[PDB]
Amino acid sequence: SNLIEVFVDGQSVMVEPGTTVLQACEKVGMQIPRFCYHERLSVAGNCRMCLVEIEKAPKVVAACAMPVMKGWNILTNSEKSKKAREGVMEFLLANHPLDCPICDQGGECDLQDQSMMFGSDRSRFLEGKRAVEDKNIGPLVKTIMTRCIQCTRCIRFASEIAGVDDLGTTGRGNDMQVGTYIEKMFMSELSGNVIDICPVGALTSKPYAFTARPWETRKTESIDVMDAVGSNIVVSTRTGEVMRILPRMHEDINEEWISDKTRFAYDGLKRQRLTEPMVRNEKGLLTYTSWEDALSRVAGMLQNFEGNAVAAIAGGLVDAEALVALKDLLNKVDSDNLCTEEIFPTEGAGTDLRSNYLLNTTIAGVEEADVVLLVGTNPRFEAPLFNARIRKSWLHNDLKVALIGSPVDLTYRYDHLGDSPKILQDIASGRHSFCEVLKDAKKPMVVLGSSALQRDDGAAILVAVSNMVQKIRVTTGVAAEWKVMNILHRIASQVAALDLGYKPGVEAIRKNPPKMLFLLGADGGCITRQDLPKDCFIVYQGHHGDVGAPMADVILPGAAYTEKSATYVNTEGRAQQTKVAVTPPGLAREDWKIIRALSEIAGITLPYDTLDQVRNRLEEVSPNLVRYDDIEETNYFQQASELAKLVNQEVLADPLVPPQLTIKDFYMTDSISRASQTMAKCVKAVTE
Amino acid sequence: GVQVSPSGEKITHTGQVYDEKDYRRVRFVDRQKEVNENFAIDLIAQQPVNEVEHRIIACDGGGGALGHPKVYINLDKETKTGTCGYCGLQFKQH
Amino acid sequence: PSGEERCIACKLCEAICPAQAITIEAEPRADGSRRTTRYDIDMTKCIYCGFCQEACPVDAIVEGPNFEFSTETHEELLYNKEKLLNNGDKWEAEIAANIQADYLYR
Amino acid sequence: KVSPPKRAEMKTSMESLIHHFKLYTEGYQVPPGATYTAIEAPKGEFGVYLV
Amino acid sequence: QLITVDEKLDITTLTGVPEEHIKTRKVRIFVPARNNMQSGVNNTKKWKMEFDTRERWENPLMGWASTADPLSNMVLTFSAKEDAIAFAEKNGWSYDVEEKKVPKPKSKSYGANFSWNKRTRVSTK
Amino acid sequence: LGLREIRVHLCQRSPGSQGVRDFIVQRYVELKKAHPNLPILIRECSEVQPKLWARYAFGQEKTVSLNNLSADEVTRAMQNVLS
Amino acid sequence: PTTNPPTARKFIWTNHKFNVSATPEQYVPYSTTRKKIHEWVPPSTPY
Amino acid sequence: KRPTVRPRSDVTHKQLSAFGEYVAEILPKYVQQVQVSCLDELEICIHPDGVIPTLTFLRDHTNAQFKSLADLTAVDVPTRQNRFEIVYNLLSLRFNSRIRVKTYADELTPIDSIVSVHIAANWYEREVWDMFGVFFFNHPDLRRILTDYGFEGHPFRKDFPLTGYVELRYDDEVKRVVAEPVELAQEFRKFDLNSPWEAFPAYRQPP
Amino acid sequence: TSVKPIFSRDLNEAKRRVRELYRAWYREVPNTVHLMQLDITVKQGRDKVREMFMKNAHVTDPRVVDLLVIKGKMELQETIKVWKQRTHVMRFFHETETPRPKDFLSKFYMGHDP
């Protein structure tokens, strides 16, 4: 049981010990006002706005921090608490500056709405205010500190979630100034979240600076496509444009937090973009033309070729509907060269047995763990929120992390197990120092990235890991349902690809250099015209001409994640649905729409003609993808282990350093990210 | 700053001018485009700094209830100077 | 009086405009200032109510005395920032006086 | 919180500026309920049933 | 007296809308997510029912945002979810329902910030 | 003409799919060894009636509804697909 | 204004203008904003 | 005594509660949920079958001579399965008082008409049919009033767009005021104004 | 199930009223093309009547059918009388709206709509 009967305005409610008054009242529906407490940060009763009387006690108590005692009535709308709130608002708004029309958190200010409900309507303040020196953090966070209410909701984030500890308070009295004592670029992969944390507009975003206002904005609940975390997101528009990004609340992923890319990379969706189908003319130059011309060229060339001479590279910012469409359209000209830019070993179960290329634990499952073992990853600069859940666990459920790779800051101490993949065998033997620690563990999880598998020994590394993992389950009998092996991706359009049946890598294309290439969103530089036949026909179905468009004989402008309803499977396997926010520009269209139109121009005329039909087709191939937000429990890891122990490929005597080593390498890893002024500014700041 | 483009159109303080191939230049045929010659950027630049004695002062427009809300500006920095959000006047202390 | 543009794109003249006549699109000016890149008024939607000038916190947009601005084209009655600033630079000698007379009531 | 403040009070006080802002952008959040109120308009009973 | 009508309640022949906005259209039933700027949650608590967005475009005169659909600024509110499914099935709209997202309860402690052994010992105050 | 993909669809807890799990844990390794280049996709869900799709050269897909089957009959029908 | 004249300002118009509705030098509306969605300019070389 | 707030009495509240008990116990076959508000406005809620008897009672009864129809509204609430809340505001002129009788309806659950009691209800029932789509039995005319003749739609329904589905303009090809579909040069800008804070705890909905 | 009627015990007794209404329209068209000088032939007017009837043939609820009959009687009243003008009647024909393309590839060539 271990329960407690508590009353709230008389009404009874049953809550555990260790709770507080704010949570007790939330169980009823009342939320007490607040400026310091967040529900994800350490408590600090510094605003003194959460003040409520108890029915017979002589004074008021901090409802954010006072734990609730047996036999209490919490009086929220009593005159004592209302007097307290009115006084606290008086004090807060005393030195606050009349900058509400300037301030970008204008129709978004908790101080406003709390003055409007829980506060007086008049100033009896007849003295001069103060004014505080402002700080130049960086190209994102615009500090105007004449209006900070000294709530410390930012230092706690920076210390407990970002793990930075470069933000504090200087002095005392009114003269206490939040921030650094020095000039320091607070430049982290979780830094734009302070803009949502700070209820006041003491710090805002520079890209959104002075642009729009919250009532103007329509809000479409979409998802992210930068990383494979699946961070739920709100895209805010204003008269057909995109103004800013914001987080959504999902507790299994994006725990109210998002990375700085996916909230300062929307700038890239309006630069170096594709708006018209372009075809190659007599002089060998691209020229804007119609849709019919381009699709007729493509289909004319397509009717001729059949089989090995038709390939496809899906990379990065690609749907699952587009993948299914291109897959069907190449199967119906009997070609199977459906490939993805990033390698994953096929030397065992391969893309069969979903458990092998998946976070078989959950991102929430990291909380229910005692040891974590990172291999070939820098989870900070790829899936940053996964590292954030790791740190949350590191704090509130004392966790010991290991690392195999290069020594790099993760925001916590990580027990560096050298730099080599022979240590995997050393562990699987049973002799390493780490097994003394791991035998005590009852719920571990190794998690290997899709950045060590891009090497020429990915299959061997996976076999070593699976062997180690099975010997680990043998050593520590964990459970009948606890997963230990996990795969971290950094690409949104990879899990759906491998689900549908795409073959990871490029090696089939180098093996059988085709006379065609469809290069779907493949603005990476893996394949080039120096590797392909003489008189090759490359068509690029995408956006953001970076390196994949200029090497193409025709172009088919596609749409971005902000501009189409689509599905993107994250690392866990959770399929998540985008919602159309803004239509794509020029003569740009959806991807699967283009493939179906090309098909009708040719003689295949694929059966489906709308979006529900393509979703049902996705059901036919992999029915995990129409299951939105419904994570599915895979199995059959033993089978993959038996099927992967068979092959025998040595592991090199080579260390494994990740590509994203410093923060310099984090802000530009994409097309949208590479075509962007804000990310370039952050790079300019870090490297100078 | 009413420099023109090579297409002959005046350019606004919001640098706006239509491209040469933009067909929307028709509407200025037998007509013109209204543009204000008095740019506020150059004008408020044509305004000196008001030196003061204190580290913290206030700013309204100058009429009181006819200007803008009272705001306070800190003048502890010496390399640069203060600036009002509403107006664009500047202040410094000796 | 310094010639500085008085609007700051606080974007509530269009919040309250009960005809949805006003649009604003705002940016920093390269001086580092909250200012507009757009201020349009469809004067064929305006109802001449005064809410915008009694909502502006800086006395930037006003509703002046000119009632003799009839036109032979619909497109002329769709204003922008430059036309409104022309009006202001034209009618300041009147509007300043009207404001001086009417304040202490508003 | 219902009727806007004086033009000078919203230029020296922060509270009254907040209230100006919310009144002139959002409104004042009348409670739920309903009424029928009638007056003698010069034609007759001018009535309004608000919800 | 009474009647035994079996078939699905259908109203589209009464509503006076075109076939286009009935069949082509898609509907999102949901509780809106809280604005992460404000810590308030009253803008939640009511199931809403929005429509799919459509092409907006720059008006060639002034640059205003134009439309060709009237359901753009469309929002309804329902105290529950089955009410919304009912209204949509009744008016002939294909719907996608996003389930209710509730934050996890959490164990707060102001004493964990001053521990002897744990990592919750915050270096600040 | 020739076979290009098989893909198996099943459930984790529903008993009608029982027979496919046993078939997998028994014969999947031997089958992959027999056909290593060939893929066979195994995608499971909460509540779906089992299937067994097979894709030949063109977009020629053919199914058998193996709901409430044994494991030996699953193997027999799968060999019928292969042959 | 011969006794209580108005304030002098650098930006006030000196010469008034009557109503211009059908003449030239009348008013024509236009978007004061700029290009938002920039296009991709392809290269001027082949391959 | 407080100036800013509105004065308050109790005798009107008590009178109207008494009359509510009166109607409730005199007319139980139909009556539901009598209620009196903070502002003293009596408000009786009625089963749709009880419309003529209740209205005839309040018109012709001696202690209730509600023989003047002020309004006859409707209110669309898409949530509840019986959408349209229909309202009957009345006054007496003998007791200097008002009352409000309420019923409910749906798209396919119409109501008897009231011209047999209040002839004033003719054009109001026509307006309600036009605006919300509530058919009224044994009505003489029951055609539109306010909408154009060739008009499909019940505009004041909450699921109806503000701007509509058709737009008019003259065409020289046919020399008529044709009706094209709707295409606006400026989309109506929906503003999200509601604050995320409980302003009135007295109306707090529990889960 | 278990709902009230309006004017119709069943669907056949509603089709009765439907046919009465079709009859009234068929007998009214020649008078409407004459009274207000429409520039169409009686054949295509009656074809329009049958078209706007078969626009709602999928329905099976008697109550919906009765309401449609009511609205048809309203429009017939408006048309028998000259409360509505040539504009309103020729509104039915859509003599200015280009045909919505009922094909995929045309929609793809113009617009993002399905």
Ligand code: SF4
């Ligand atoms: S934070 Fe901004 S909007 Fe809120 S009270 Fe301060 S100046 Fe006004």
Ligand code: SF4
């Ligand atoms: S900057 Fe913002 S979050 Fe940090 S203490 Fe000040 S008000 Fe709080």
Ligand code: SF4
């Ligand atoms: S005119 Fe006034 S109210 Fe309108 S945006 Fe400018 S400063 Fe704000």
Ligand code: SF4
């Ligand atoms: S006066 Fe005109 S522009 Fe100003 S708020 Fe009223 S309707 Fe809008």
Ligand code: FES
């Ligand atoms: S919310 Fe409790 S003191 Fe700040």
Ligand SMILES: [Zn+2]
């Ligand atoms: Zn100033």
